[PDB]
Design a protein around this ligand. Structure first.
Ligand SMILES: Nc1ncnc2c1ncn2[C@@H]1O[C@H](COP(=O)(O)OP(=O)(O)OP(O)(O)=S)[C@@H](O)[C@H]1O
Ligand SMILES: [Cl-]
Ligand SMILES: [Mg+2]
Ligand SMILES: [Mg+2]
Ligand SMILES: [Zn+2]
Lengths: 337, 230
């Protein structure tokens, strides 16, 4: 079959078409980062307005890309939450009404389940069970995954998510919002070990995270040192190394707790070069396996929604005629499949 | 000449269908429930008159102004339907729609339409029906402070009917204006009243492909200041 997936949860409009035989047939994306940069954060009303401008044109482009017509589509999946209510509503209203007009099922998709299943789009996808580390702008969670919709929350950040931590320190370094990826580029030129950040919540037991204290440590380090490019790169590297070391320690403890041999990483921060290398190295030493999405499917995109939509449709999940969005929607509450 | 109209730009939710020489319509107050009601209502009105979406000649939608969220629900639903069935779309002003409603209910041919825009402002228009039933005055649509509306009214003459929640918010809007004001008996737009406007635009070739549909928000100021230096 073929599913059209629609993602409008925050500031990316992503549309994709996934065929369960031939794989991904189309993938279209518009990122609004330039629209929000001048404000230092996503402005919900501007985000909502721009999804209206992009959603239909990118669906039209997706069909053209794939060389498909309306009749080739078997279901429409759309992100229903979590996310920004105004942004979710655009993709969800377009999606549900399109499905009605095409007389195909409409599949409401959980945004984080989309992230979690993104590594399934690659060759050699993970088998159950696995530990999943979801690390994005607003989420940082460890999950025990024993099957589709069988997600047990093991731990989560009690403050800043890893992604927002990257963005806040990047802002302190004078980078444009969201500066996470650019901080990582700076870090690549940094001298290992010149500064040393703490690894919060690693001295105590448990699987929860905290990153807010790293913004403070960064701020104080920045103001107490010189402003030359090398020093700034050294600060970026010490920050990145501390976040990565913290995530690795927590992943290790999750693998210990569950007994699992597979670790899946997803969400925007899973695009991080240092994190990908360090978790791969860890899994090699454990004689286990790591799994991640291609870098462009780590951050928000439509491909993961088309895929998760296909999985959910096959599990019997469809929408009635109501358009329901859920801006806060815990992953652990999804029905098993 | 089969036209389906939908609207969710205000606290109301409504759909209407002109098909086979009859008009069917449904209107209800749906505060906070638009997303749960709109597609069931579309399905219901279509099924009732035995019409398929792909047999529709044009899809009319409430383009705004109104609630930013509601305007977007309306255009989003309309876009999905129009994309799905390859329908041309006709955007209809919520302000003109209420003018048409005042005419239907009271015979009013000159209408001062005001919508409570929040933030101490109103969406405003001055609409006047010509001999052919076309509402002139679209160029007057604006978001305005009540004081500015009051100044504007002193430049108008004669008898007008008032419609919209802007008058609910500011019933003293026209104090000392010198106009003769009648109640237009319309607080919210109804899809039924979009139909004659849509039929005029259809005949004039003033429809658009789904990718060209645009909301009319009127208020376009961001409500957040840019960072220092931008
Ligand atoms: N190479 C990178 N290194 C570190 N962080 C990155 C990198 N690439 C992206 N990010 C961060 O990933 C975050 C965005 O990830 P996304 O999955 O797109 O976020 P999001 O969907 O808005 O967050 P949610 O709603 O909580 S899943 C941002 O904070 C980015 O800074
Ligand atoms: Cl906003
Ligand atoms: Mg984003
Ligand atoms: Mg908490
Ligand atoms: Zn995301």
């Amino acid at each position: 079959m073929r599913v059209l997936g629609i993602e409008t949860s925050c500031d990316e409009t992503g549309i994709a078409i996934y065929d369960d035989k031939k794989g991904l047939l189309a993938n279209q994306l518009y990122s609004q980062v330039k629209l929000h940069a001048d404000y230092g954060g996503v402005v919900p009303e501007l985000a909502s307005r721009d999804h209206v401008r992009k959603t239909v044109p990118l669906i039209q482009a997706a069909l053209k890309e794939a060389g498909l017509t309306a009749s080739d589509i078997d279901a429409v999946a759309y992100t229903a939450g979590p996310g920004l209510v105004g942004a979710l509503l655009v993709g969800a209203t377009v999606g549900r009404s399109l499905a009605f007009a095409w007389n195909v099922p409409a599949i409401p998709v959980h945004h984080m389940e989309g992230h979690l299943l993104a590594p399934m789009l690659e060759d050699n996808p993970p088998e159950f069970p696995f530990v999943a580390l979801l690390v994005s702008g607003g989420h940082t969670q460890l999950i025990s995954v024993t099957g589709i919709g069988q997600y047990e929350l093991l731990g989560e950040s009690i403050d800043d998510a890893a992604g927002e931590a990257f963005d806040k320190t990047a802002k302190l370094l004078g980078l444009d919002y969201p500066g996470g990826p650019m901080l990582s580029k700076m870090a690549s030129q940094g001298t290992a070990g010149r500064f040393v950040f703490p690894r919060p919540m690693t001295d105590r037991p448990g699987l929860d995270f905290s990153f807010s204290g790293l913004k403070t440590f960064a701020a104080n380090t920045i103001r107490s040192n010189g402003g030359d490019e090398q020093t700034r790169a050294d600060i970026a590297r010490a920050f990145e190394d501390a976040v990565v070391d913290t995530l690795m320690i927590k992943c290790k403890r999750a693998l210990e707790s569950t007994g699992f041999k597979r670790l899946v990483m997803a969400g925007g921060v899973s695009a991080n070069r240092t994190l990908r290398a360090k978790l791969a190295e860890m899994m090699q030493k454990r004689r286990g396996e790591v799994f991640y999405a291609r870098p462009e499917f780590c951050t928000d995109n439509g491909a993961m929604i088309a895929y998760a939509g296909m999985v959910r449709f096959k599990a019997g999940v469809t929408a009635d005629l109501g358009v329901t969005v859920r801006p806060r929607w815990p992953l652990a509450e999804l029905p098993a499949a | 000449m089969r036209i389906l109209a939908i609207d969710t730009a205000t606290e109301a939710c409504s759909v209407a269908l002109w098909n086979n020489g009859t008009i069917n319509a449904h209107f209800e107050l749906c505060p906070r429930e638009h997303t749960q009601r709109i597609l069931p209502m579309v399905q219901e009105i279509l099924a009732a008159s035995g019409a398929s979406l792909n047999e529709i000649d044009a899809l009319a939608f409430g383009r705004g102004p109104g609630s930013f969220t509601g305007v977007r629900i309306g255009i989003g639903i309309a876009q999905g339907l129009a994309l799905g069935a390859n329908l041309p779309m006709i955007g209809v002003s919520t302000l003109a729609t209420m003018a048409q409603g005042a005419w239907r209910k009271t015979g009013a041919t000159r209408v001062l339409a005001a919508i409570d825009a929040r933030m101490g402002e109103v969406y405003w228009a001055e609409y006047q029906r010509d001999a052919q039933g076309v509402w002139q005055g679209e160029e007057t649509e604006a978001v305005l402070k009540p004081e500015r509306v009051g100044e504007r009214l002193k430049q108008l003459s004669g008898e007008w009917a008032t419609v919209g929640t802007g008058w609910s918010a500011w019933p003293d809007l026209a104090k000392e204006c010198g106009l003769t004001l009648h109640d237009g008996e319309v607080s919210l737009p109804a899809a039924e009243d979009m139909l004659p406007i849509a039929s005029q635009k259809l005949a004039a070739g003033e429809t658009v492909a789904v990718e060209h549909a645009e909301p009319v928000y009127l208020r376009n100021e961001v409500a957040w200041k840019k960072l220092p230096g931008k």
